[PDB]
């Protein structure tokens, strides 16, 4: 139990146990993503293990979901569905506990060696439901291109259609290979291009017309119309057979 570390990795290195072997990944506002880890169980979250500052977490030999996707590209339809839906399989346990991410995005979407997709990074996450209250949110974080627009223009917001956006962008992401726009305000050419419903143009023409319908569902401006989880679990896209 005295670890190797054998490289760096992003301040993250590698760690290896002589004694067994199994490999960690050791990543060395804080107290909270300790708090935050300590709750966190399931399949499609990057699992804590301790800490000592130093925290362990469940190293995944896949990579990240960017190097997944081929740029102006994306990747193969089937392989983007599977990782939506494990994507919303997390999505869905954090909400269950109320817990945000705040900052959903490839570079935070870790794979497994099975492939499985694992949300990192709870150093930017909050509360939003305590005691069957939801407490809306004020503050700004994240990652520009992910961010939902009522976050730049709105003192107060809800935590859930705010990562439900971000998804909404990923999906964009695996699927055309490109980010829609450099952030989602008025100012942004692309983005009033698409609130027209200019889909002749990129990244949508690249995009099959039943996942675009859709992004077309998730990319809502109003949060209030902005669908939500259980609803996209009854997409015809999201349902639909692929090999
Ligand atoms: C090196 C990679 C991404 C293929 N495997 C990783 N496993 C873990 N656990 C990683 C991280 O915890 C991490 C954290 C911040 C920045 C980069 C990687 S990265």
Known sequence: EDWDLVQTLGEVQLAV?????????????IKKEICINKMLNHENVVKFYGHRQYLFLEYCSGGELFDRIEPDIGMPEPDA???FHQLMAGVVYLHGIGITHRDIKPENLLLDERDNLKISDFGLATVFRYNNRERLLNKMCGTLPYVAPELLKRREFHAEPVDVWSCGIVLTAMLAGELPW????????????????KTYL??????????????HKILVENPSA???????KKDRWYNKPLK
Request: include cysteine; proline fraction near 8%; hydrophobic fraction near 35%.
């Open 226 to 232: 902005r669908i939500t989880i259980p609803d996209i």
């Open 182 to 197: 450099d952030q989602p305000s008025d100012s942004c050419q692309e983005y009033s291009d698409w609130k027209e419903k």
């Open 17 to 29: 146990n002589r004694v067994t072997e199994e490999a960690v990944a050791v990543k060395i506002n």
């Open 81 to 83: 569905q599977r990782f």
């Open 202 to 215: 990129n990244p949508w023409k690249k995009i099959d017309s039943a996942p675009l319908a859709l992004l």
